[PDB]
Amino acid sequence: DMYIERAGDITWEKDAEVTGNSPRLDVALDESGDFSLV
Amino acid sequence: TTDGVYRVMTRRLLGSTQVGVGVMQEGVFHTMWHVTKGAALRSGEGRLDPYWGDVKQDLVSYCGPWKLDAAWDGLSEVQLLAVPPGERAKNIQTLPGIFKTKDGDIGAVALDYPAGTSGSPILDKCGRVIGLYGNGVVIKNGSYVSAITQGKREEETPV
Ligand SMILES: N=C(N)N[C@@H]1CCCCNC(=O)[C@H](CCCCN)NC(=O)[C@H](CCCCN)NC(=O)Cc2cccc(c2)CNC(=O)CNC1=O
């Protein structure tokens, strides 16, 4: 039994918490949908 | 099929497990292929049948074709509307990095959430869904970077 349950509206939050860097990565995508680092 | 973000749950004999997340828009449910493995979904007393999908993109839509057409503009911050298992939906803002591929650049977010957060929407400042979270790579120190995965909204199919 795989089922869905609503979890909210989709909105941009003003004054949201910011985090994370912005990495630049060389990757390959294969025919099965896997990303790998080169 | 009211618009919004939804958890994707599985139930066997015991309790339920959240295996992912998806977006309902224009009567179509959008999630990542690895969440459902492209199988049917229940919504209330109704059945949602797979309609379009692509395992390489790791995407699947239910009840109709892929509807989400907004794109990252390549320089603005974005928000992940993370819907983690057992936790309230929350917005996290970030400046994407880049997956550089032989076929072009893909925006990518260095945000690390449980596996069942897969399919959570990534948003632009207008609240448009510019992709879904959860197909990515693990970099050297063990942290995670997700592609901003977006499908193509095709033109109306002839008749
Ligand atoms: N810090 C981590 N590792 N964080 C993730 C965030 C998932 C976010 C949601 N997305 C996924 O669940 C996908 C599913 C597979 C899609 C394949 N098309 N997965 C991934 O995109 C990566 C891909 C690796 C590259 C494939 N060439 N797979 C993993 O990360 C597997 C992994 C690896 C090491 C350790 C762990 C898991 C243990 N960590 C957890 O148990 C919870 N955290 C995560 O699992």
Residue numbers in the entry:
A (entry chain A): 50 to 87
B (entry chain B): 18 to 176
What did the study's authors say about this model?
A series of cyclic active‐site‐directed inhibitors of the NS2B‐NS3 proteases from Zika (ZIKV), West Nile (WNV), and dengue‐4 (DENV4) viruses has been designed. The viral protease consists of the N‐terminal third of the nonstructural protein NS3 containing the catalytic triad composed of residues Ser135, His51, and Asp75. NS3 has to form a complex with its cofactor NS2B to achieve proteolytic activity. Due to their essential function in the processing of the viral polyprotein, they emerged as potential antiviral drug targets.
Stepwise truncation of the linker segment by replacing GABA with β‐Ala or Gly provided the further improved analogues 9 and 10. The inhibition constants of analogues 8–11 revealed that a 23‐membered macrocycle represents an optimal ring size for targeting all three tested flavivirins and that it comes to a drastic drop in potency after further truncation in case of inhibitor 11. A crystal structure was determined for the best inhibitor 10 in complex with bZiPro. The P1 interactions are similar to those described above for the complex with inhibitor 4, although a stronger contact (3.0 Å) between the P1 guanidine and Gly159 is formed. Interestingly, two conformations of the side chain from NS2B residues Asp83 and Ser85 were found. In one conformation, the side chain of Asp83 is directed to the P2 Lys amino group (occupancy 53 %) as found in most other complexes. In the second conformation it interacts with the P3 Lys amino group (occupancy 47 %). In case of Ser85, approximately 37 % of its side chain is directed to the P3 Lys residue, whereas the major part (63 %) points upwards lacking any contact to the ligand. Although we used identical P2 and P3 residues (Lys) in all inhibitors, we have only found two conformations of the Asp83 side chain in the bZiPro/10 and bZiPro/9 complexes, which were equally directed toward the S2 or S3 pocket. This flexibility might be relevant for the efficient binding and processing of the natural occurring NS4A/2K cleavage site segment within the ZIKV polyprotein.
